Amino acid sequence: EENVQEFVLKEDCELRFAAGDDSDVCLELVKGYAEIFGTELLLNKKYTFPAKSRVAAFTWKGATIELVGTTESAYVAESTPMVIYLNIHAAMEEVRKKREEQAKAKGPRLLLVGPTDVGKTTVSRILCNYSVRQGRTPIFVELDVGQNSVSVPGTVAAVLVQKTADVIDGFERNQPIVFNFGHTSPSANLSLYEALFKEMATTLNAQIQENDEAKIGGMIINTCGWVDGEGYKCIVKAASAFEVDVVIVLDHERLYSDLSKELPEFVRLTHVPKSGGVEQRTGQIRSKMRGENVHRYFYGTRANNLYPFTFDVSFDDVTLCKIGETKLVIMEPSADIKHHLFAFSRSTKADENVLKSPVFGFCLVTEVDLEKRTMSILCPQRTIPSKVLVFSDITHLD
Numbered sequence: 001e002e003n004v005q006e007f008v009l010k011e012d013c014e015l016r017f018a019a020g021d022d023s024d025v026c027l028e029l030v031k032g033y034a035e036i037f038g039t040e041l042l043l044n045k046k047y048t049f050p051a052k053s054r055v056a057a058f059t060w061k062g063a064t065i066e067l068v069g070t071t072e073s074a075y076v077a078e079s080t081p082m083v084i085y086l087n088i089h090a091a092m093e094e095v096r097k098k099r100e101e102q103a104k105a106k107g108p109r110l111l112l113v114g115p116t117d118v119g120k121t122t123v124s125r126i127l128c129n130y131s132v133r134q135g136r137t138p139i140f141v142e143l144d145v146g147q148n149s150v151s152v153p154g155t156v157a158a159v160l161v162q163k164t165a166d167v168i169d170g171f172e173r174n175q176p177i178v179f180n181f182g183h184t185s186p187s188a189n190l191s192l193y194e195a196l197f198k199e200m201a202t203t204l205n206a207q208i209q210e211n212d213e214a215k216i217g218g219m220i221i222n223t224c225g226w227v228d229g230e231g232y233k234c235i236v237k238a239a240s241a242f243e244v245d246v247v248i249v250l251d252h253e254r255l256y257s258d259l260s261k262e263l264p265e266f267v268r269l270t271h272v273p274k275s276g277g278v279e280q281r282t283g284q285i286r287s288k289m290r291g292e293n294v295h296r297y298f299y300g301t302r303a304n305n306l307y308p309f310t311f312d313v314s315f316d317d318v319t320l321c322k323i324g325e326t327k328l329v330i331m332e333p334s335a336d337i338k339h340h341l342f343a344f345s346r347s348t349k350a351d352e353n354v355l356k357s358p359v360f361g362f363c364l365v366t367e368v369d370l371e372k373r374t375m376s377i378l379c380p381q382r383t384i385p386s387k388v389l390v391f392s393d394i395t396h397l398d
């Protein structure tokens with residue numbers, strides 16, 4: 001945390017680096033202009049990245065960048081797909097302008113698809129940032145229940161993006177619409193997963209009728225990496241449910257070939273390569289990452305800490321329930337709920353409505369005292385926002 005590496009980037013180059021397993025890396029742009037996944041860097045601002053961060057700082061015009069601290073790897077790459085990503089943004093904006101002159105105008109809807117670790121989340125981040133920098137407010141839709149960049153694992157979620165991502169923390173999640181799926185993969189309950197994203201689409205369609213900026217902002221929709229078997233059919237159903245105009249396939253020629261023959265002819269399908277900077281991650285690291293996501297939901301980040309409450313709740317004061325493949329079941333408080341997330345349902349009653357109701361948020365059950373009929377929960381707020389708690393199979397040791 002003291003030794004220094006200096007890099008000169010020519011136009012259209014990016015510095016790719018990974019922080020050591022053991023320490024922070026601090027990046028500073030010292031000359032020119034640069035961006036990290038679409039967010040512009042401020043000249044001479046010091047950006048501190050935590051252990052194991054994997055980052056690319058790209059420049060359109062040329063830049064000089066300093067890194068302070070131990071890196072596992074740091075090199076300048078001279079060939080990237082960045083112009084491709086920019087041209088996708090450019091095309092979307094063109095569509096917005098055309099529909100604005102025709103008109104309230106509906107923004108383009110883009111579905112990003114492809115297998116795991118082709119940079120789908122990063123590309124969605126770049127596209128959302130570019131939209132924001134264009135003065136638009138797109139809706140980012142997260143359909144990946146495993147690796148979710150909006151809420152905890154086991155959710156389908158959407159958020160109006162009004163500010164570029166923080167280079168370190170990612171997007172500010174200002175009042176997301178969140179549905180509790182309750183599993184880390186769609187395969188655990190396919191019919192529910194489909195019902196949820198269709199409910200999401202319906203909800204969003206009504207929301208944007210009341211908000212013209214969001215309506216023309218359009219949608220950038222991230223799917224999970226499940227592209228084979230039933231995962232393929234989910235992509236097709238998502239494209240239909242969200243009425244997408246554009247499908248971007250990342251690094252999967254077969255999937256691109258299949259969708260070309262299946263999607264309605266009006267849908268523009270674009271195949272794009274993955275960046276050579278994308279890290280291929282193991283199941284083990286993916287699991288640790290879901291864990292860190294849960295931790296972040298309650299405790300926030302090093303930049304912006306959250307201070308969650310720990311208090312006891314009487315089993316007389318709540319109803320516990322679980323979905324599933326369609327039926328709600330009332331759960332009797334038990335030892336087996338310990339370590340599980342529960343969602344605070346927006347439905348006032350534990351009835352048919354829970355299934356299609358969004359949630360206020362989550363709590364984590366840390367202890368269960370069956371004798372006293374109480375549980376200890378970790379919760380974002382001082383009191384529970386709902387008396388209806390919906391089971392999630394996602395567990396976390398805090």
Ligand SMILES: Nc1ncnc2c1ncn2[C@@H]1O[C@H](COP(=O)(O)OP(=O)(O)NP(=O)(O)O)[C@@H](O)[C@H]1O
Pocket residue numbers: 016017053054055056115116117118119120121122123144147224225275276277278279
């Ligand atoms: N051009 C790049 N240079 C360096 N690192 C990158 C680059 N693009 C992506 N990464 C990093 O590689 C990792 C994987 O990127 P990500 O966009 O999450 O892939 P993904 O396809 O969404 N993976 P998943 O959805 O979990 O199957 C993250 O740490 C990114 O920050």
Ligand SMILES: [Mg+2]
Pocket residue numbers: 120121122144147
């Ligand atoms: Mg992803």
